[PDB]
């Protein structure tokens, strides 16, 4: 397969793949291969995009070196190395955020980056972190040291005290930020309850339940208007909830990818579309009706295009 990583960009319109020979960048909806820059030897385990520009953040095989790659110039322009392993990298026009197993470091997007802030987190081997790219919102959210709590920080007005949200009681397994940067979704390791909070307040906007059996949550994502939300769990299972109606606690739709491989989920071009990128190189598009039933159903192998 060669697939080591897959992740959506900030508008979920594109998704990039880290491969053992290099990286690939795809268009989410419709599916199309935009770029495949092989010959990058090392094995890319994390790719971060800054919308549809030319800069990509790549984490090598050793996971100790963050490399910014200018696809226009076809070369590495910035290289930040770390003594510990890099778990994730988040990008924005003026800041480069690097996720470590114990802390979050914010650098500048200059030729020689300048570490601006250091935030402490709990043990974060998943690399949980979200960063609003919107120009009017430089919000950064990461697991706090309090097991189950989320800490929010405005990267612009850093002097303001952070926001400690007592989200869950166990170890956090997934976090998600809406496109507008105003609402955040949380999930514990039990994976039975999903909670959405306000990033500017810190109150439970809505709590949703996916099932009774404990499952490990993989990916969570809002839509544009933050009215719907899709949650992926084990065996490629995706639940689609409604977020702006307290009269709904369950998911109005639920599907499974044909291969049953775990996947990441995000909404597509059509307002009733949900895209699922599975670990086995599978692409799955799901169209639902207002009641939740399936209408169309597209499946393909994106790594073979």
């Amino acid at each position: 397969h060669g697939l080591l990583y897959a992740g959506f960009n900030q508008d979920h319109g594109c998704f990039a793949c880290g491969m053992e020979n290099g990286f690939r960048v795809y268009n989410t909806d419709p599916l199309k291969e935009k770029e495949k820059q092989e010959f990058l030897e090392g094995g890319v385990g994390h790719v971060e995009m800054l919308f549809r520009c030319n800069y990509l953040a790549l984490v090598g095989g050793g996971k100790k070196k963050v490399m910014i790659w200018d696809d226009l110039k076809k070369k590495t322009v910035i290289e930040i190395e770390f003594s510990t392993e890099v778990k994730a990298v988040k990008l924005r026009r003026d800041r480069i955020v690097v996720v470590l197993d114990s802390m979050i470091k914010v650098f500048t997007f200059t030729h020689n980056p300048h570490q601006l802030h250091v935030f402490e987190t709990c043990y974060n081997p998943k690399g949980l972190c979200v960063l609003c790219p919107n120009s009017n919102n430089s919000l950064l959210a990461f697991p706090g040291t309090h097991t189950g709590h989320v800490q929010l920080v405005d990267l612009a007005s850093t002097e303001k005290p952070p926001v400690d949200i007592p989200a869950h009681e166990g170890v956090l397994s997934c976090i998600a930020l809406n496109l507008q940067g105003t609402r955040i979704a949380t999930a514990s390791e039990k994976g039975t309850l999903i909670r959405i909070f306000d990033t500017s307040s810190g109150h439970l906007i809505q709590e949703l339940r996916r099932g009774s059996q404990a499952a490990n949550i993989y990916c969570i994502n809002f839509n544009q208007d933050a009215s719907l939300i899709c949650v992926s769990s084990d065996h490629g299972t995706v639940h689609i909830f409604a977020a702006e109606d307290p009269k709904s606690k369950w998911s109005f739709s639920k599907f499974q990818v044909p291969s049953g491989s775990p996947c990441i989920c995000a909404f597509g071009t059509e307002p009733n579309a949900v895209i699922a990128i599975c670990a086995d190189g599978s692409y799955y598009k799901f169209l639902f009706n207002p009641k939740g039933e399936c209408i169309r159903d597209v499946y393909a192998q994106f790594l073979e295009m």
Partner: peptide, 22 residues
């Protein structure tokens, strides 16, 4: 002074193509 500003600006502000992938 212009070159001084450039080397002290974010790389997306200097060399970028926000439609490189679309």
């Amino acid at each position: 002074a212009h070159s001084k500003e450039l080397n002290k600006l974010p790389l997306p502000s200097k060399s970028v193509d926000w439609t490189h992938f679309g």
